[PDB]
Write a protein that binds this ligand. Structure first.
Ligand code: FMN
Ligand code: FMN
Ligand code: FMN
Ligand code: FMN
Ligand code: FMN
Ligand code: FMN
Ligand code: FMN
Ligand code: FMN
Ligand code: FMN
Lengths: 183, 183, 183, 183, 183, 183, 183, 183, 183
């Protein structure tokens, strides 16, 4: 399974870090990190962004349009935008593929490949909601990171693993990352 | 400030508990708890629902339409639906005021009083998103509990206090519940 | 009163200069100037852009996302985009917060803070008009600089002071910058 | 070139006066002045409205439906509504041809003749914007008088000549009324 | 508090009379009465319309566009159209400010001032309902005079005072004009 | 059968004259003639408008809102607007009942009585077509006078009788005014 | 000027006959006649359809897709569908180019050439009106044959010449076929 | 894999010929050729249409509704309409299953089977674009034959093989028909 | 004839090269090449981008907003975006004039000058199709490079000359670049 993981400049890049490590030995992972996300990884995770780069089977710069990912002639199974900034949510919904992340999302939509986006914002305004609705109407899986608590998390890590486990659920990847509802 | 806190049957009732206690001595709080939320409080917080009832200046049953809240002739400043189930999100968006919670939301909209809803679901489908968009277009503040991490939470409690602090921000209530972006 | 003044690359930056000086001692003013507007200030006002920078209580670069303004956790009262380019009008209407100006407009909309935009173009096409209509429908005050003449302006300065006085009117700031209709 | 100039009751009738005199010897000009505009000409230009009447090759009263203009069987090249009141903008957008001005605009639309409207209002509300969008979508040129300043106006007259020069530009009439962008 | 009371030609002008007298010493009231409403006041209240004129701090004729109210440069707090004819409901919804009443409603919408309309008709058709929906979507308070009976009215006067008390409620004016729901 | 015949200022008032005389002894006919139609009757039929007035069982001035027709409490079976000007088509579609004709059309729609309109214009623009579509969607019978020729008309009179016969067909009135398709 | 005249199966083919003869020596006319129109020409004009065929510079069968007209690579100035059946109005509006007539209309729309349609039906339903509105919105000239009477027609021929003269007006062809409004 | 290949009357039937031969020994292919496409195969490929018929595992006439394909009770995996005429694009988008091709497309949509359409036209008008948008919104893969050149085609054959290879890509059929982007 | 040729980063820049050379001595050509297109010219045409620069009467950098083209006060006859990337298609449709190419397209739309766009993508998704539909609805000529084969191309060059000949057709430029349908 070939999964494109796209990190954009919004709070909660810890979700992307955890997803990348639970995917390490279970899927071919291509990684793209926007310039804004590089600064957020540094600020929120107190590690340099290149530390995230090594958890993927391949990495491409967000401005490297000569990447093989930038064409529908090349194939992949799924895209995960985690977290998804409001800027990138807008670009995906309107087709403004000015970087590699939005280009591979636009490719996923035209080639009918699975597209998961995790918009992180609070509150949402009507522009965010309409951009999400449009993409959901086109078959994208709109999945803002909204933890539940029926698994009774004991720490931050339990919350992160719930969100990531649900992402793997949507990807069709079996996991036991969280205590499910039936316990 | 008179605030109506409405707890519906969705995961994350811990947000409602924390909001009620930080509001205890700062606002007149009226509380409504749906039957489904009573079971979720018991399951997720391992306390009986009547323990939540005592944190409010007033309580009304979700089926008590003779409550003073059930009429626009009586006044309040804000409604907070936390967490907001998809069922109640649907009812508010379509005006199906079959219980007291949806009735006071419908009152808030016709009387132009502040309405905050916190829909808790993951992923969202297009029905959820359109119901949220409609309500946001009418002036409701659509605020799913989506924690950020730039405050670097050290525990579950730091995550809950971020979400609740943002709710107080929207209510216009000064608080220091979380480390803000400028630190 | 904390007002964010955003200057974008469209003709009529003299409006922004006049607004900044009548606001100098009456409000806490944060200023953002886009790169395009820096060139227009130089071309139309024959002064370097840093001369405008000093009229504000604070300045932030349009690419400084680490500015405190870039988060809803921090507070302000109003945003004024003067003048508003068609590019920035598009970005605000579609949520493409790729710079600090659009990000604080998007924040204003989600946090329900006052947003004033002054699109400067002639003629308008249907894309401009639909972008303005959408934002007006969301509660933004869409205010292209369209001077009136019932005050009988004697010079360019009287025209600029009419437009700026109307902006202060919308902000709720008492002023006598122009001869009102009742004279 | 036969141009219908329609003056309605909104501020800025000086634009109509200047347009009429630069058109004097370059086009066959038919003029209509609404009753409200007659009062505004008097108040803003301190001249009687009949002084404007003499600058046209023909004049018709706004209630003279027996005018030849009131039928599509008769021909013209363009209509200019300057300035355009919000009332007349509404009437044109909804087809309420209760006077000669709106009737010749409705004729222009059905006969596919050029229609220019210059709505003068500040701010615009959503009703104005939707009425303009509808007309722009039908091929009308929606042109609120929004002066630019890259020509560095030295006086009110330079501002008026910029707006009027742009109107002549849209009409296809060569002019040197303003210093263009390339200088 | 400066309130514009606008009486249009629909049945139920008794509501406007009662509102004007309960507002007499509690707000600065400007009054406009349409020609049709003058005849309805005479027919339904068996008093000459000038008897209503004296209950206001100021009066303006519906055709007096030189009134200070006819410009956004002048300020007011709220407009109440009571009762609102279907003709005037249409004009407000479509922006056809052909008289002073609709002009001050259009001003209220562009200046974001409170607008209350009380359309009186039975039944409503789809044109009425869409005109009301549009205005409600723009933030107007659409308030047809629909008395309730939980206050157990003993006479016509109790019904009129309920409707008027609710109008004062929306205006933010404290009153005891009716027995509220909580009794 | 009580039929309201409304003549508005558009070409083809001969249709209204012929309809009124074929209805003379077969239905109770109430007649309203707009001021514009009075001039068109004079110009196109070379007879004074009062000659048309005598063919009806009752006549009311277009500004006589005290007419019994102006209330839904009074009853009628059908309204025929023949011919229908574009101005009146607009007013009916938008609910702008500023005269008795549009008021009785609006009454017909709310009371669910039969409404026939015969818009006379050529070509139609998109505003006309949308106004007709809206009214047709509400159940009005939109019937521009478009003669057919399968009856092989020998003179103008045969064309007028075809159009009028079709109107009687829609009214449910048996007639032999034209040679039907089956001959 | 190269004009495509398309006759479809609706009443009023006399309009097409008259248009073809007034165009004989003033434009290059290509003619297409549908099978249904061939029967209507015979029934309504009591002449064989081949009599109409000779009035054109070229004729093509409605099923001859190898005609040069059937490609946008070949050029023409205008299409006139007279009369336009409801079936063909539907096909044009929905793009169902199953014959040569609809194909050249679809070509006219993609190549931005003038398209005139004359739908003949009475009354219209909402399907007709929406099909006309869509085409008018795309720039087609929607022109049902609706004669006026201000020219005071003395016979059927005067009515036919009014309609045809208006068609030539829209085509930009000078004519004196009817007494215009200014007489 | 059972694939229905449908050839309609538009230029570029060479794409259908090439697709049929690369599919010969890799899938069960059912073929339908419209009458118009039979003429285009003859004109553009200078071979009789029956030469194309032999490349399929089964053939059915476009009017043979007794074909097993004409019912959803029978199964297939994918439909490819190559090339897709504007007429057939319209019929599919509107559900006008008047032949076997459109019927199996309508079946594919109701049974949720893969539907690929390749509309061939240049330019497109708004009717084409809306018909494509509607079908794309329903899950059809809208794929006009638009060759790329990053594979550096050396001849017409390289262009045809790129388009066909992309079709096989969408079908999930591995192929090396073109030099992919990563070379 | 002044034509703006805009090359954006999509496959098929050979179309732009061929169009520029057939336009060399027949029109005043202004050229803009985006940074992405510069790389694609190098990769697909194996020539440096400056080789394309010399075929135009003028060249401007895509970031040179001080170019005379960047203002509506300066005039041109037509814009051709060939090829049009999905990113630039999005920007034009939404008005995001962040570079000179989109700015001159936005100018073309407001000044009602001819705009031709040639989006190159396969397949299209619903975002592409809606962006094209919107622009086509505004009067842009949406012309993806979709070659036909009725001219029986013998080589790649014949395909390129068909597409370019059709572009000249839309521009109103006589050419014999391809064998037309009538041969
Ligand atoms: C510390 C920080 C946190 C941010 N958090 C968010 C966020 O949570 N949601 C959001 O939409 N934007 C957020 N932003 C702003 C975005 O980073 C900004 O819009 C940026 O342009 C996104 O670009 P990208 O999608 O290419 O990463 C944040 C910015 C900073 C500096
Ligand atoms: C343990 C549990 C957790 C649930 N969590 C959610 C949830 O997170 N979001 C949601 O929409 N519904 C959730 N539901 C289902 C809702 O409770 C259900 O739709 C209910 O009818 C809501 O009614 P109420 O809004 O009146 O409380 C949950 C149900 C259970 C038993
Ligand atoms: C001298 C000059 C004047 C301009 N005037 C306008 C204008 O009046 N309206 C507009 O929409 N764009 C105008 N532009 C183009 C914008 O500056 C351009 O779209 C830019 O990208 C806007 O970016 P910004 O909003 O970040 O400032 C002008 C450009 C120049 C060089
Ligand atoms: C002094 C004065 C200035 C006005 N200015 C405007 C204006 O700038 N914009 C506007 O929409 N209406 C304005 N109005 C109100 C309009 O004149 C009013 O709506 C009138 O009915 C327009 O009618 P008309 O379009 O037939 O001229 C103004 C009125 C007055 C008395
Ligand atoms: C006695 C009487 C009662 C009326 N009642 C109503 C009414 O209740 N609702 C309504 O929409 N129109 C009613 N009308 C008709 C309106 O007065 C008419 O449409 C008028 O043009 C409204 O104009 P205005 O809004 O400027 O007052 C009534 C008319 C009369 C004579
Ligand atoms: C001689 C003459 C003929 C007219 N013919 C038409 C017409 O055929 N269609 C139309 O919409 N307006 C026509 N008009 C204009 C209308 O009369 C005008 O819009 C008027 O305001 C209609 O008002 P009413 O509907 O109250 O009669 C004509 C005007 C004149 C003077
Ligand atoms: C005598 C006769 C008259 C007709 N008149 C009309 C008409 O006036 N309007 C219409 O829409 N259809 C009319 N029809 C039906 C159309 O001819 C029918 O829908 C036909 O399929 C149109 O096909 P065409 O557009 O290819 O000519 C008439 C049919 C007949 C036999
Ligand atoms: C030589 C020729 C080429 C054609 N090319 C096209 C084309 O490229 N696109 C199109 O929409 N129609 C084209 N047509 C017209 C269609 O064949 C026509 O609309 C036909 O009815 C389609 O029917 P079908 O889809 O059942 O094959 C062409 C016609 C001919 C004769
Ligand atoms: C080799 C190559 C080929 C590309 N082909 C296309 C294409 O055919 N269609 C498309 O939409 N984008 C294509 N792209 C991606 C665009 O270049 C990218 O979205 C870019 O940002 C467009 O920017 P521009 O419009 O300013 O040139 C291609 C990229 C590369 C590297």
């Amino acid at each position: 399974m070939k999964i494109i993981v796209c990190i954009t400049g919004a709070s909660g890049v810890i979700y992307a870090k955890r997803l990348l490590e639970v995917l390490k030995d279970r899927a071919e992972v291509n990684l793209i990190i926007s310039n804004s996300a590089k600064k957020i990884i540094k600020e929120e995770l107190d590690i340099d962004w290149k530390e995230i780069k090594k958890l993927a089977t391949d990495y491409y710069e967000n401005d490297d349009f000569f990447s093989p990912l930038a064409s529908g002639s090349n194939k992949f199974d799924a895209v995960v935008v985690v977290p998804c900034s409001m800027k990138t949510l807008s670009a995906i919904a309107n087709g403004y593929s000015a970087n590699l992340i939005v280009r591979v999302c636009d490719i996923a939509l035209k080639e009918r490949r699975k597209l998961i986006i995790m918009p992180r914002e609070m509150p949402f305004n009507s522009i965010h909601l309409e951009n999400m609705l449009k993409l959901s109407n086109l078959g994208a899986i709109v999945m803002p990171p909204i933890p539940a608590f029926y698994n009774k998390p004991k720490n931050v890590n339990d919350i992160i693993n719930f969100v990531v486990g649900r992402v793997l659920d949507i990807l069709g990847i079996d996991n036991s990352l969280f205590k499910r509802w039936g316990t």
